[PDB]
């Protein structure tokens, strides 16, 4: 039961190692979230191998404790419940027409910086598509995010779609399946079906050499009046 955690701006430190179709990268990232407003500002970069997939395909993997819960659906609020041991976020997702990433992360408190260290699996790729052909856009659509209480779990079960615009004009699917599980063993709060209406810039730091994002973020729970 861990909102308390949040109400000021919190550091946050994300952790990535990917491999998409042998391609072996490692993405670091460093920001902050102050979750009374929904906000998030992060830098990520590269550290390893050349990235072999574009920055917008990374956006959902590279922390939604940090989403604005209007006080009337502070119940259900399952992320900050699981705070301070954390939760496992695990995805699988589908790229039209093109390979899947499969994605295991952790994210807890170590002290007081919020951490998001994650595995990225990417397999069955096609070697010119979108991805691996890097033919997307440097932007970023808004959307919303749907949430479902996993009992059996004690977690959650989240579904959403990413539309990544290609530089043709066309656009890149992506299907995102999401669970989260409680890493410690407390109650946390299972929640009634809700969204996160999630809203995305990317931006580059002009001093900045090495392959690298900047993300503006603002998330805000809806769908439940009282």
Same mark, same amino acid.
């Given at each position: 039961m861990g909102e308390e955690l949040f109400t000021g701006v919190v550091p946050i430190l994300v952790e990535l190692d990917g491999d998409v179709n042998g391609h072996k990268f490692s993405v670091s990232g460093e920001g902050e979230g102050d979750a009374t407003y929904g906000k998030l500002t992060l830098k990520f970069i590269s550290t390893?191998?050349?990235?072999?997939?574009?920055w917008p395909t990374l956006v959902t993997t590279?922390?939604?404790?940090?989403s604005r819960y209007p006080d009337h659906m502070?119940?259900?609020?399952f992320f900050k419940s699981a705070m301070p041991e954390g939760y496992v976020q695990e995805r699988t997702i589908f790229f039209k027409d093109d390979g899947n990433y499969k994605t295991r992360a952790e994210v807890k408190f170590e002290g007081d910086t919020l951490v998001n260290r994650i595995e990225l699996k990417g397999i069955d790729? #096609?070697?010119?598509?979108n991805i691996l052909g890097h033919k997307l856009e440097y932007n970023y659509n808004s959307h919303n995010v749907y949430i479902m209480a996993d009992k059996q779990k004690q977690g959650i079960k989240v579904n959403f779609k990413t539309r990544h615009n290609i530089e043709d004009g066309s656009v890149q699917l992506a299907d995102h399946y999401q669970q989260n599980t409680p890493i410690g063993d407390g109650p946390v709060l299972l929640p009634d079906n809700h969204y996160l209406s999630t809203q995305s810039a990317l931006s580059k730091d002009?001093?900045? #050499?090495?392959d690298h994002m900047v993300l503006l973020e603002f998330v805000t729970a809806a769908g439940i009046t009282h």
């Open positions: 390893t191998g050349k990235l072999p997939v574009p590279l922390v939604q404790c940090f502070k119940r259900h609020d790729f #096609k070697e010119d598509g002009p001093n900045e #050499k090495r």
